[PDB]
Amino acid sequence: GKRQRMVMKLESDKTFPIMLEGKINGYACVVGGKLFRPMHVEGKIDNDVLAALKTKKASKYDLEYADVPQNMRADTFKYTHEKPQGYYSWHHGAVQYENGRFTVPKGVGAKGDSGRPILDNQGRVVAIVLGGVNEGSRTALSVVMWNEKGVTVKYTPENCEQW
Amino acid sequence: GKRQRMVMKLESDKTFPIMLEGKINGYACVVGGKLFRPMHVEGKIDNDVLAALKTKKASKYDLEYADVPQNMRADTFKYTHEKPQGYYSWHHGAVQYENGRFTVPKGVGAKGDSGRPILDNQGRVVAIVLGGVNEGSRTALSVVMWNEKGVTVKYTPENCEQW
Amino acid sequence: HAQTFTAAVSKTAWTWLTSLLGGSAVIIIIGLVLATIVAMYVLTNQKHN
Amino acid sequence: SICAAIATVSVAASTWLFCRSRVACLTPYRLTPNARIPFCLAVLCCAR
C-alpha cells in the first residue's frame, strides 16, 4: 500500500480526469512537457487551461499530443526509457513487466481507467495505459512507451478492448 | 525430500496426463502458450478445452503442438535457453546435467513417462522427456530443449526407448 | 493508300505522350517505393521495444 | 507423352523437395513457445 500512496500523491497534481456528464472516461497525463490524451475517450479535460488547447491528432498510436505552456513545464512527470524486468507501480497497486509486456492481476480494468501512467521505483513514467485484454488469471496491457533510441513505441496484445 | 513437492504443486495445475483406456501413457505440457504432446503417446488430454484443439505435427522432433487459448496463456510454464551444469529437478527425483546430457540414476523411467517437463532451480522448464536408454548403472534421456537463438534442439542417445 | 490508325503521330507528339504519361508512372512507382521503405523503417524502429 | 511424363514428374518432385525444405527451415522456429520468426526467413519462406 506504500507504493499506491506514492502513485496517488504524484497523480494528485499531474493527472486530470476526462469527464463526460460527470462520469470518468479517461485521464490526461502531463509527462515531459507535453499533454497526452487518448483518442477514444470522450469528454473534456478537468483543468481549464488544458481544455482550451488545440491537440494535434495522431490516430495510429491512439494519442492526442499537445504542448505545455512555459509556466507549467516544471510541473510535469519525469520519464525514462530504462526498464529492467520486475515490478512497477500502477494506480491500483503493482504491475508485472515480463518479456516486454505489462501485466496486472485480474479483476481491475474497466471502462474509464485509461490514460493512467505507470511509474517506477524512482518516480518516472515508463508507460501510458490505453487498454488491455484479460488472459484468464492475469490481464495484459496495451500501452505506449519509449526506448533508448528516442522513439515512441506502442505495444498491443491480441483482441485488446479500449478502456 | 523437498524438491519434488513444489514440482508436484506445479504439475497439479499445468501438466496434464493423457487418458488411455485404463492407464496413463503420457503427459501434455502447456508452456509459453503452446500445448505440447508426444507422438508415440496416444490417447485423450484430460481437459475438454485442450482436447478439441487440433495439433500440428513435427516428425523430426516427435511432438504434436497446438495453440493455447487466450485465457490459458498466463497460466503456462516458462522456458529458459541458458542451462549451466549441475542438478535440475524432475517428477521422479533429480536429474544430472553434464556435457549436454540429462541423465538419471537408474531404476526409474519406464512406460508412461513421456512429456514430463524437466524444471530448474527457479521453476522454469528447460527440457521435455521423450525417453531414454540404460547407460550402465545410470540412465540418460532423450529430450527436446531450446537454445539462445530460439531453435528447438532434440538430443537422442544410441538406441533409446520411446517411453 | 490506306490510312492506318496511328499513321500521322509525328515523333514530337510521341515524345509528349511518352513523357506526360510514362513519366507519371515513374512518379507513382517512386512514391510507392518510398512508401514501402518508410513502412519497413518504421517496423525496424519498432523492433527495438 | 514421354516429354509430358518427364515434365510432370520433374515439377512434382521439385515441388515436393521445396515443401520438404520449407518445413525443414520453418520447423525449429514454430516449435518454440514464443514463435518469434526472424524477419528474413519470414520474407523468404512466406511465414507469418
Side-chain angles (χ1 to χ4, degrees), chain D residues 20-40:
Chain D
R20 287 177 66 90
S21 296
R22 184 176 182 271
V23 171
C25 284
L26 294 176
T27 299
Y29 293 94
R30 292 179 183 175
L31 284 169
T32 59
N34 54 3
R36 291 181 182 177
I37 301 169
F39 180 72
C40 64

PDB file of all heavy atoms in Angstrom, chain D residues 20-40:
ATOM      1  N   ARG D  20       9.467 -29.928 -48.572  1.00  0.00           N
ATOM      2  CA  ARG D  20      10.314 -30.529 -47.544  1.00  0.00           C
ATOM      3  C   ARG D  20      11.323 -29.531 -46.994  1.00  0.00           C
ATOM      4  O   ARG D  20      11.525 -29.451 -45.776  1.00  0.00           O
ATOM      5  CB  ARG D  20      11.040 -31.755 -48.095  1.00  0.00           C
ATOM      6  CG  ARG D  20      10.157 -32.961 -48.306  1.00  0.00           C
ATOM      7  CD  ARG D  20      10.946 -34.107 -48.915  1.00  0.00           C
ATOM      8  NE  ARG D  20      11.979 -34.630 -48.024  1.00  0.00           N
ATOM      9  CZ  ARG D  20      11.785 -35.615 -47.150  1.00  0.00           C
ATOM     10  NH1 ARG D  20      10.593 -36.190 -47.049  1.00  0.00           N
ATOM     11  NH2 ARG D  20      12.783 -36.031 -46.384  1.00  0.00           N
ATOM     12  N   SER D  21      11.935 -28.730 -47.867  1.00  0.00           N
ATOM     13  CA  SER D  21      12.912 -27.757 -47.391  1.00  0.00           C
ATOM     14  C   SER D  21      12.254 -26.597 -46.649  1.00  0.00           C
ATOM     15  O   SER D  21      12.836 -26.074 -45.690  1.00  0.00           O
ATOM     16  CB  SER D  21      13.743 -27.244 -48.559  1.00  0.00           C
ATOM     17  OG  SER D  21      14.509 -28.292 -49.123  1.00  0.00           O
ATOM     18  N   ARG D  22      11.041 -26.198 -47.048  1.00  0.00           N
ATOM     19  CA  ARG D  22      10.348 -25.131 -46.331  1.00  0.00           C
ATOM     20  C   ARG D  22       9.931 -25.584 -44.936  1.00  0.00           C
ATOM     21  O   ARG D  22      10.055 -24.820 -43.969  1.00  0.00           O
ATOM     22  CB  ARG D  22       9.130 -24.658 -47.116  1.00  0.00           C
ATOM     23  CG  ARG D  22       8.432 -23.478 -46.474  1.00  0.00           C
ATOM     24  CD  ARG D  22       7.285 -22.970 -47.305  1.00  0.00           C
ATOM     25  NE  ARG D  22       6.650 -21.813 -46.687  1.00  0.00           N
ATOM     26  CZ  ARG D  22       5.646 -21.890 -45.820  1.00  0.00           C
ATOM     27  NH1 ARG D  22       5.163 -23.073 -45.467  1.00  0.00           N
ATOM     28  NH2 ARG D  22       5.127 -20.785 -45.306  1.00  0.00           N
ATOM     29  N   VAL D  23       9.455 -26.826 -44.814  1.00  0.00           N
ATOM     30  CA  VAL D  23       9.134 -27.369 -43.499  1.00  0.00           C
ATOM     31  C   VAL D  23      10.396 -27.513 -42.654  1.00  0.00           C
ATOM     32  O   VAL D  23      10.409 -27.148 -41.473  1.00  0.00           O
ATOM     33  CB  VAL D  23       8.373 -28.700 -43.651  1.00  0.00           C
ATOM     34  CG1 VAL D  23       8.217 -29.401 -42.319  1.00  0.00           C
ATOM     35  CG2 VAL D  23       7.001 -28.435 -44.244  1.00  0.00           C
ATOM     36  N   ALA D  24      11.496 -27.976 -43.259  1.00  0.00           N
ATOM     37  CA  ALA D  24      12.737 -28.156 -42.512  1.00  0.00           C
ATOM     38  C   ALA D  24      13.387 -26.840 -42.105  1.00  0.00           C
ATOM     39  O   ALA D  24      14.190 -26.829 -41.168  1.00  0.00           O
ATOM     40  CB  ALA D  24      13.724 -28.992 -43.327  1.00  0.00           C
ATOM     41  N   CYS D  25      13.067 -25.732 -42.779  1.00  0.00           N
ATOM     42  CA  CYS D  25      13.531 -24.441 -42.277  1.00  0.00           C
ATOM     43  C   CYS D  25      12.596 -23.865 -41.222  1.00  0.00           C
ATOM     44  O   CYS D  25      13.061 -23.379 -40.186  1.00  0.00           O
ATOM     45  CB  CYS D  25      13.703 -23.436 -43.419  1.00  0.00           C
ATOM     46  SG  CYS D  25      15.180 -23.694 -44.428  1.00  0.00           S
ATOM     47  N   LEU D  26      11.286 -23.902 -41.454  1.00  0.00           N
ATOM     48  CA  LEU D  26      10.378 -23.212 -40.547  1.00  0.00           C
ATOM     49  C   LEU D  26      10.046 -24.015 -39.293  1.00  0.00           C
ATOM     50  O   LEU D  26       9.463 -23.453 -38.362  1.00  0.00           O
ATOM     51  CB  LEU D  26       9.086 -22.847 -41.278  1.00  0.00           C
ATOM     52  CG  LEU D  26       9.278 -21.819 -42.394  1.00  0.00           C
ATOM     53  CD1 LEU D  26       7.980 -21.594 -43.130  1.00  0.00           C
ATOM     54  CD2 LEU D  26       9.807 -20.513 -41.833  1.00  0.00           C
ATOM     55  N   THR D  27      10.401 -25.298 -39.243  1.00  0.00           N
ATOM     56  CA  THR D  27      10.042 -26.120 -38.089  1.00  0.00           C
ATOM     57  C   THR D  27      10.771 -25.763 -36.788  1.00  0.00           C
ATOM     58  O   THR D  27      10.081 -25.680 -35.755  1.00  0.00           O
ATOM     59  CB  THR D  27      10.209 -27.602 -38.465  1.00  0.00           C
ATOM     60  OG1 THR D  27       9.326 -27.912 -39.547  1.00  0.00           O
ATOM     61  CG2 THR D  27       9.888 -28.517 -37.305  1.00  0.00           C
ATOM     62  N   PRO D  28      12.091 -25.505 -36.733  1.00  0.00           N
ATOM     63  CA  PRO D  28      12.685 -25.148 -35.430  1.00  0.00           C
ATOM     64  C   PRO D  28      12.281 -23.785 -34.888  1.00  0.00           C
ATOM     65  O   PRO D  28      12.643 -23.470 -33.750  1.00  0.00           O
ATOM     66  CB  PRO D  28      14.193 -25.187 -35.702  1.00  0.00           C
ATOM     67  CG  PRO D  28      14.348 -26.041 -36.857  1.00  0.00           C
ATOM     68  CD  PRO D  28      13.178 -25.733 -37.711  1.00  0.00           C
ATOM     69  N   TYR D  29      11.551 -22.970 -35.643  1.00  0.00           N
ATOM     70  CA  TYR D  29      11.072 -21.695 -35.140  1.00  0.00           C
ATOM     71  C   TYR D  29       9.601 -21.721 -34.757  1.00  0.00           C
ATOM     72  O   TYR D  29       9.165 -20.870 -33.977  1.00  0.00           O
ATOM     73  CB  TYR D  29      11.313 -20.600 -36.180  1.00  0.00           C
ATOM     74  CG  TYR D  29      12.775 -20.308 -36.398  1.00  0.00           C
ATOM     75  CD1 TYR D  29      13.484 -20.930 -37.415  1.00  0.00           C
ATOM     76  CD2 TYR D  29      13.452 -19.429 -35.565  1.00  0.00           C
ATOM     77  CE1 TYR D  29      14.821 -20.669 -37.611  1.00  0.00           C
ATOM     78  CE2 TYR D  29      14.793 -19.158 -35.758  1.00  0.00           C
ATOM     79  CZ  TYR D  29      15.471 -19.783 -36.779  1.00  0.00           C
ATOM     80  OH  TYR D  29      16.804 -19.519 -36.971  1.00  0.00           O
ATOM     81  N   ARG D  30       8.828 -22.673 -35.277  1.00  0.00           N
ATOM     82  CA  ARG D  30       7.428 -22.802 -34.897  1.00  0.00           C
ATOM     83  C   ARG D  30       7.244 -23.621 -33.631  1.00  0.00           C
ATOM     84  O   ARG D  30       6.183 -23.543 -33.004  1.00  0.00           O
ATOM     85  CB  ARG D  30       6.625 -23.443 -36.028  1.00  0.00           C
ATOM     86  CG  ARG D  30       6.471 -22.586 -37.274  1.00  0.00           C
ATOM     87  CD  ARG D  30       5.685 -23.339 -38.332  1.00  0.00           C
ATOM     88  NE  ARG D  30       5.565 -22.595 -39.581  1.00  0.00           N
ATOM     89  CZ  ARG D  30       5.001 -23.081 -40.681  1.00  0.00           C
ATOM     90  NH1 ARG D  30       4.507 -24.310 -40.686  1.00  0.00           N
ATOM     91  NH2 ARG D  30       4.930 -22.344 -41.779  1.00  0.00           N
ATOM     92  N   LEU D  31       8.244 -24.414 -33.250  1.00  0.00           N
ATOM     93  CA  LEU D  31       8.170 -25.231 -32.047  1.00  0.00           C
ATOM     94  C   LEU D  31       8.486 -24.476 -30.768  1.00  0.00           C
ATOM     95  O   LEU D  31       8.212 -24.999 -29.687  1.00  0.00           O
ATOM     96  CB  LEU D  31       9.119 -26.418 -32.160  1.00  0.00           C
ATOM     97  CG  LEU D  31       8.673 -27.567 -33.045  1.00  0.00           C
ATOM     98  CD1 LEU D  31       9.821 -28.498 -33.245  1.00  0.00           C
ATOM     99  CD2 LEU D  31       7.570 -28.293 -32.340  1.00  0.00           C
ATOM    100  N   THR D  32       9.062 -23.286 -30.850  1.00  0.00           N
ATOM    101  CA  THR D  32       9.371 -22.542 -29.641  1.00  0.00           C
ATOM    102  C   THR D  32       8.091 -21.960 -29.040  1.00  0.00           C
ATOM    103  O   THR D  32       7.123 -21.704 -29.759  1.00  0.00           O
ATOM    104  CB  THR D  32      10.371 -21.433 -29.946  1.00  0.00           C
ATOM    105  OG1 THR D  32       9.829 -20.553 -30.940  1.00  0.00           O
ATOM    106  CG2 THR D  32      11.665 -22.036 -30.438  1.00  0.00           C
ATOM    107  N   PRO D  33       8.048 -21.780 -27.713  1.00  0.00           N
ATOM    108  CA  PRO D  33       6.812 -21.284 -27.084  1.00  0.00           C
ATOM    109  C   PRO D  33       6.465 -19.842 -27.414  1.00  0.00           C
ATOM    110  O   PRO D  33       5.309 -19.450 -27.215  1.00  0.00           O
ATOM    111  CB  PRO D  33       7.093 -21.459 -25.588  1.00  0.00           C
ATOM    112  CG  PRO D  33       8.092 -22.549 -25.527  1.00  0.00           C
ATOM    113  CD  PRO D  33       8.964 -22.360 -26.718  1.00  0.00           C
ATOM    114  N   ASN D  34       7.402 -19.043 -27.914  1.00  0.00           N
ATOM    115  CA  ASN D  34       7.085 -17.688 -28.350  1.00  0.00           C
ATOM    116  C   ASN D  34       6.784 -17.585 -29.839  1.00  0.00           C
ATOM    117  O   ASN D  34       5.986 -16.725 -30.235  1.00  0.00           O
ATOM    118  CB  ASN D  34       8.227 -16.729 -27.997  1.00  0.00           C
ATOM    119  CG  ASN D  34       9.579 -17.181 -28.538  1.00  0.00           C
ATOM    120  OD1 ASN D  34       9.692 -18.189 -29.238  1.00  0.00           O
ATOM    121  ND2 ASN D  34      10.618 -16.429 -28.204  1.00  0.00           N
ATOM    122  N   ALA D  35       7.413 -18.447 -30.647  1.00  0.00           N
ATOM    123  CA  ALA D  35       7.310 -18.487 -32.107  1.00  0.00           C
ATOM    124  C   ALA D  35       7.659 -17.125 -32.719  1.00  0.00           C
ATOM    125  O   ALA D  35       6.873 -16.505 -33.439  1.00  0.00           O
ATOM    126  CB  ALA D  35       5.926 -18.966 -32.558  1.00  0.00           C
ATOM    127  N   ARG D  36       8.866 -16.675 -32.405  1.00  0.00           N
ATOM    128  CA  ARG D  36       9.381 -15.408 -32.913  1.00  0.00           C
ATOM    129  C   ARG D  36      10.212 -15.726 -34.150  1.00  0.00           C
ATOM    130  O   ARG D  36      11.410 -16.004 -34.064  1.00  0.00           O
ATOM    131  CB  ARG D  36      10.185 -14.666 -31.857  1.00  0.00           C
ATOM    132  CG  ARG D  36       9.333 -14.139 -30.717  1.00  0.00           C
ATOM    133  CD  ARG D  36      10.167 -13.389 -29.708  1.00  0.00           C
ATOM    134  NE  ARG D  36       9.369 -12.927 -28.578  1.00  0.00           N
ATOM    135  CZ  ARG D  36       9.874 -12.300 -27.520  1.00  0.00           C
ATOM    136  NH1 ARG D  36      11.177 -12.059 -27.455  1.00  0.00           N
ATOM    137  NH2 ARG D  36       9.080 -11.915 -26.530  1.00  0.00           N
ATOM    138  N   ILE D  37       9.555 -15.687 -35.299  1.00  0.00           N
ATOM    139  CA  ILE D  37      10.214 -15.963 -36.578  1.00  0.00           C
ATOM    140  C   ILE D  37      11.113 -14.786 -36.932  1.00  0.00           C
ATOM    141  O   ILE D  37      10.669 -13.628 -36.846  1.00  0.00           O
ATOM    142  CB  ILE D  37       9.165 -16.201 -37.666  1.00  0.00           C
ATOM    143  CG1 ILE D  37       8.268 -17.379 -37.285  1.00  0.00           C
ATOM    144  CG2 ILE D  37       9.819 -16.470 -39.009  1.00  0.00           C
ATOM    145  CD1 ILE D  37       7.045 -17.517 -38.157  1.00  0.00           C
ATOM    146  N   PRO D  38      12.376 -15.016 -37.298  1.00  0.00           N
ATOM    147  CA  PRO D  38      13.215 -13.914 -37.773  1.00  0.00           C
ATOM    148  C   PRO D  38      12.709 -13.394 -39.109  1.00  0.00           C
ATOM    149  O   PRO D  38      12.083 -14.122 -39.884  1.00  0.00           O
ATOM    150  CB  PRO D  38      14.601 -14.550 -37.903  1.00  0.00           C
ATOM    151  CG  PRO D  38      14.322 -16.001 -38.102  1.00  0.00           C
ATOM    152  CD  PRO D  38      13.094 -16.301 -37.305  1.00  0.00           C
ATOM    153  N   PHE D  39      12.989 -12.116 -39.367  1.00  0.00           N
ATOM    154  CA  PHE D  39      12.290 -11.396 -40.428  1.00  0.00           C
ATOM    155  C   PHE D  39      12.712 -11.857 -41.819  1.00  0.00           C
ATOM    156  O   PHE D  39      11.872 -11.950 -42.721  1.00  0.00           O
ATOM    157  CB  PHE D  39      12.519  -9.896 -40.271  1.00  0.00           C
ATOM    158  CG  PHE D  39      11.828  -9.069 -41.312  1.00  0.00           C
ATOM    159  CD1 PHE D  39      10.452  -8.918 -41.289  1.00  0.00           C
ATOM    160  CD2 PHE D  39      12.559  -8.433 -42.303  1.00  0.00           C
ATOM    161  CE1 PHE D  39       9.813  -8.156 -42.244  1.00  0.00           C
ATOM    162  CE2 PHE D  39      11.927  -7.667 -43.262  1.00  0.00           C
ATOM    163  CZ  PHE D  39      10.552  -7.529 -43.232  1.00  0.00           C
ATOM    164  N   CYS D  40      14.000 -12.158 -42.007  1.00  0.00           N
ATOM    165  CA  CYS D  40      14.496 -12.545 -43.328  1.00  0.00           C
ATOM    166  C   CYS D  40      13.935 -13.893 -43.765  1.00  0.00           C
ATOM    167  O   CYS D  40      13.541 -14.062 -44.926  1.00  0.00           O
ATOM    168  CB  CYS D  40      16.020 -12.570 -43.326  1.00  0.00           C
ATOM    169  SG  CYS D  40      16.740 -13.813 -42.227  1.00  0.00           S
TER     170      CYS D  40
END
